[PDB]
From a paper:
In this work, we expressed and purified the [name] domain of tPkwA (referred as tPkwA-C), and performed a systematic study on its stability, thermodynamics and folding kinetics. In summary, our current studies showed that tPkwA-C, a prokaryotic protein is a [name] domain with reversible unfolding property and thermo-stability. Structural analysis and biophysical characterization reveal tPkwA-C is a typical [name] protein with extraordinary thermodynamic properties.
The three-dimensional structure of tPkwA-C was determined by molecular replacement with the model from our WDSP server and was refined to a resolution of 2.6 Å. The solved structure in P1 space group has five molecules in one asymmetric unit. Each molecule of tPkwA-C in the ASU folds into a seven-bladed β propeller with amino acid residues 449–738. The blades 1–7 were arranged around a pseudo seven-fold axis in sequential order and generated a water accessible channel in the middle of the propeller. Structure alignment of the five molecules showed that Chain B had the most significant conformational change from the other ones, and the most variable regions are among strand Ds and loops on top and bottom surfaces, which are supposed to be the interfaces for interacting with other proteins. More specific structural features contributing to stability are further revealed by crystal structure of tPkwA-C. The hydrophobic cores in the lower part of tPkwA-C surrounding the Phe 467 and Trp 485 seemed to be major factors stabilizing the structure. From the comparison of five molecules in ASU, we can see that these residues are buried inside the tPkwA-C structure, and exhibited little conformational variation between different molecules in ASU. Unlike other Tryptophans of WD doublets, Trp486 and Trp 653 do not form any hydrogen bond with other amino acid residues. In the crystal of tPkwA-C, they adopted two different conformations and caused the conformational variations in the surrounding region. Compared to the Trp486 in chain C, the Trp486 of chain B flipped its indole ring, with quite significant conformational change of the surrounding residues.
Numbering used by the authors:
A (entry chain E), C (entry chain B): 451 to 738
B (entry chain C): 449 to 738
D (entry chain A): 448 to 530, 536 to 738
E (entry chain D): 449 to 530, 537 to 738
Amino acid sequence: NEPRILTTDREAVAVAFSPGGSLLAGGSGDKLIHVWDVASGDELHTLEGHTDWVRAVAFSPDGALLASGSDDATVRLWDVAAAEERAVFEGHTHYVLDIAFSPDGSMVASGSRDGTARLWNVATGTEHAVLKGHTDYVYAVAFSPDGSMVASGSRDGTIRLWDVATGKERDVLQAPAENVVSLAFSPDGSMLVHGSDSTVHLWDVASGEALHTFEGHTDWVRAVAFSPDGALLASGSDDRTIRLWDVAAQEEHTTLEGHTEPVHSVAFHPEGTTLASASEDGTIRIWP
Amino acid sequence: ELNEPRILTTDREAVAVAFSPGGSLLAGGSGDKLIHVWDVASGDELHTLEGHTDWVRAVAFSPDGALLASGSDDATVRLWDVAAAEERAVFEGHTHYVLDIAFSPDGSMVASGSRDGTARLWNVATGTEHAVLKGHTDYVYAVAFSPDGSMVASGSRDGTIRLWDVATGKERDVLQAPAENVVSLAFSPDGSMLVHGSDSTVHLWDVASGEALHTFEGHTDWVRAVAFSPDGALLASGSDDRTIRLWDVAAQEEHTTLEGHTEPVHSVAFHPEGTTLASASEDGTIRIWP
Amino acid sequence: NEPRILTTDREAVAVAFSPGGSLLAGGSGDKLIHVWDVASGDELHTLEGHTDWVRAVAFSPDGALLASGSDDATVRLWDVAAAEERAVFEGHTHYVLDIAFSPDGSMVASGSRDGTARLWNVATGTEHAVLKGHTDYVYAVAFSPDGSMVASGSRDGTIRLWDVATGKERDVLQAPAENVVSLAFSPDGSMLVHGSDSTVHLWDVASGEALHTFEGHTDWVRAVAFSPDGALLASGSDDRTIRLWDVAAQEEHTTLEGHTEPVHSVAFHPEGTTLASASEDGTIRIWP
Amino acid sequence: HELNEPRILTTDREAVAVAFSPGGSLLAGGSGDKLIHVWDVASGDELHTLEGHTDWVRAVAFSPDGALLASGSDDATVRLWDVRAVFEGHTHYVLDIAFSPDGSMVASGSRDGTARLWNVATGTEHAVLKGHTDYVYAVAFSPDGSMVASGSRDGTIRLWDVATGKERDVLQAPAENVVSLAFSPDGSMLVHGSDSTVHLWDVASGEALHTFEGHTDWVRAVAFSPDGALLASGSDDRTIRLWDVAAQEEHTTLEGHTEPVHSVAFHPEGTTLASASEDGTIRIWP
Amino acid sequence: ELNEPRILTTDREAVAVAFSPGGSLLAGGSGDKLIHVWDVASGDELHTLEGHTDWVRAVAFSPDGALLASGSDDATVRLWDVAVFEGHTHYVLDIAFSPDGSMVASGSRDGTARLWNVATGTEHAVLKGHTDYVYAVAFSPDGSMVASGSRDGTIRLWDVATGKERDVLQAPAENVVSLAFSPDGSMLVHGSDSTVHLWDVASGEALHTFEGHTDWVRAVAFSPDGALLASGSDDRTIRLWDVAAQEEHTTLEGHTEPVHSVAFHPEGTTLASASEDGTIRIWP
């Protein structure tokens, strides 16, 4: 079926649902974060303060805060209700390309072009750790659902796993011949998925071995997201499509067409009924 | 960030640095027998304090910013009027090189660490003689008051850090673990932790319990200076490996490596606002970074 | 409540209370600074040495020193008890129109018609920084209560925020239809007020956003001051009045009438029960 | 009569300069709102508003042909308006402008303590008048064009030989700032308006003819009658006073009250007077 | 037992001194980073050798008198014509030419004694076994053995031909700071933070411990005849002892200063002391 559309003046490169499902946050190239009421499709208050493109957004698990990463090299925290900048994190030397909120709510992770992943302490507003190892841009970061581990995806063709507590690297998953552009954990923590150029890979987390490769995209896969029950996987690509795959059977489920430009971010509704995609065509689409 | 805003050029060994309490001035101790005071904003050289006969190994501002103290290989500690309008006293009594000095938070006393194995607590306002603390058969390289002024810590060649109660001159605890000479020490603003710089390593201690909390590894040669950030988040180290490092206290991670220097880094110091740190090196430069 | 009145032989353009509350300094067109014992109403000393109008005055936080700015292009430091000139600062090329003493007591700020804001190190007597950003005259300077920041108000329609230590500009607030003629921080440090033509504007410091505009004045607002508890705002204007505003309610509190000429400066007693104004009518008035 | 005729409005700030056109039919108002207004003396029309200045306009003057107007502003420019302006500059704020009777020259009084003299056609600065130790608040050419007179905050009235840039006389007597100046149509006398009170000076002898007392506050404005018989004073006391130039006695007092009178100008036939006041009113009286 | 001249120019601690083999020239290594050479007969300043970047802790002449070696904190050993360089990973604190003149031994802060062939410039022998900085080295007069003093509190004897440790002399409570080999090769001297010890080479036992100094003993030198031993201390005395007896022979008062280094004239007529002030002194 056909989605709904929301419109931004500029490229929408990041999207996320509030934990309750009632709000939708959109990160854009107008240097703002837009917040929509999902039911009415009305645009609530905007979040301004970033000085460059907003590349990623994520809600706190309690839904009270929103974290954002930007090309201005900063990570900001926003009070959702008040639509206010609550904090600003500095340290990254280059564009911040991804962020993730810990399931705990106490930490934000960021990935940047400076070749590091950083962890920020939400309560104190300080840097908890800098994660060093990658030799190229870090395009994606994601927390393990138990909150103990963070995974980082880099252009150096590696996926690195670190202990959140100590900042220590635990594993390196090799993905050769490729730039890892996106990462996501399954909600059960058993699987990890990464987006590459035209391809989506599945990994068994306990083993660090590759389970399967999903073929069908014809361009860079910049966004991946697991459904809340882990059964479905969504991918966003430069080929303009969004693809759904059946995780257990490891086949194509369906292809979502409609975007006229690259899809930079994909996010499931917490109930699993809806998917949101953001595209360079300046639209956010909600698909059931 | 770790980027550097400015560079100062001195042309000799810059072995000690400290910021004024307001943040606007910088004192530099040099291999010349001189102390320099710089304006941080303009980078202008305000004044040069002469009198020492040998290397100046440590410098400190009084908490009220009116006085500078300097410790030297000539075996003296000198007190300078910052305005420069007035010469001041000199502290004599140490039999060997003085490698460290620290002001008590009230500005009434100064502590000094010498190679003679003694830590001396001198009176600033008063002209009387001072208390002697004895270091354990080995030279004392480093000294620091706790922020509350109740504790003084000393770093020695015995590979231990010593804590005294300032009021009674009583030795409260002994911190052991370093495999070598402890060259620097710094209290957390909380007063809860202590930071140790030694031969290759940076240690974190729980002051109350006298236990080691962590060891920071990453320097490849002797760590000559340490500094605790005002927020307590970060730690700064200077080393003979020619780098300076910033460490995340919680995780013990290399928040940043500052790679401008070509020669050993003898001293590091945080700005009072915690935004920038200054590093001093044998390459005859002072580098300021955020 | 009718105030009490002191006189100067010429225009009184500046006033400030000692931190203890017992003294009142008045800057005038006599080229002198007058000091009054508030309780007795007696004139304790005359500070002489300026060569032109004295435009602004400020006490050191310990009350031992007074700073003054003048049309002679100089900033002077006075020993109050001794009534002696202690230092003279030179460097500004044009009239100095405002001065401020930091809470730290280590730095004096000045704003001049030469388009620059200067910071002077009181202990050493040196020029610490020249702040250059503005493209027109600087009419006001104020320190943040934490002493980390200094703000400058200019004819170029900008308010600028600088780091005191490094002299680096941090922010530029835009107020474009307006010449910024006066500034004050709230004692909290959370808000800033600026005075323009007919209006007093309130800013949120952290967000740099405009909170309110206080309307009622019918001419230039040359002086603004927060009450020590932050609850009240005072404005001095060319319309000859002083207005008090309730900060939280954003409403008019009262209008102080009596002055027969423009009110150039206002200052609160540290207890908050009394206010002093200075006027071109050659009077300083103390109002409860 | 002293009847108040049209009250002229639209300026939104202090009106600090007024002048009649030489032909009598137009009225120019300079204000603190940074503009110059031109009015039809008959009321029937509103004419133009001259915009460009960035700061207070303190003086206006018409060229003797009535085709050009000059203005002085705090923005430090002297602008000649075609009635786009042409511009002239001052190191400091410019407070007074006067055209020579000839119309060949514009004199500008400034905060830099000097009077500038420009050749209108060329635009070339010809002479700088140096001598005052403070702001120059008012300037006027003698009817023969050979002399300029100036009032300053230094409390003096000065006479200059224009061609030679040379100071010829310094008239002293005011205790305070001289705020306005006027030259007599016969050129024999000069009028001072000050922070104390109005004075008359003999041009040839460089002596005081008289002191006019009556005002109870600052005198900001003075203007001679076209026949030279009378003098008008404007004050902070809110009266306009008329004095006999010969006898030196007060003739009449006009109570145009509630407002300080900042500028006054007589009509060319002498029947009318214009006053400027605060807050942007221009008043016309016979 | 007097003393004649005092020698000047060094701006810092003079921590090494050596006479040329044949007469006549004197070398001073200092904290000011340079090596001074002095003409002994005239008491003049012949030359200053510059290049080192850090403190110079040892100097030694080649047996032909044509080359001088220096050890510095800059981690170089340099050979000077009377320059060539060698490296160490750490600070070099001491050097000694073999009596043959074919080898330079260098003791470093890397816990090893380094041995180079001078003519080829190639390092061949590394002596390992010390657990801390090596502060002093000296060849046996036959060149078959090297002795080393370390901060580990030991004196070691090594067989030169095979980089193997032959003996470990223990006893000193603290850092050994200097060592010397007697001309007959029978006795070895240790200078430490408290005392000076004599080690019997054939027996591998301690002949005796010298207890007169009241502070650290920084230097030891054997007389050319082997009869007498000089000790230099922080207490500002130089002490002469009978090697056989081990009894104190004399005390030289310098006083104001701590003696950092001592050396005998090759004829045995003169003794040179180096001090912190940046003075060199000769006594008979």
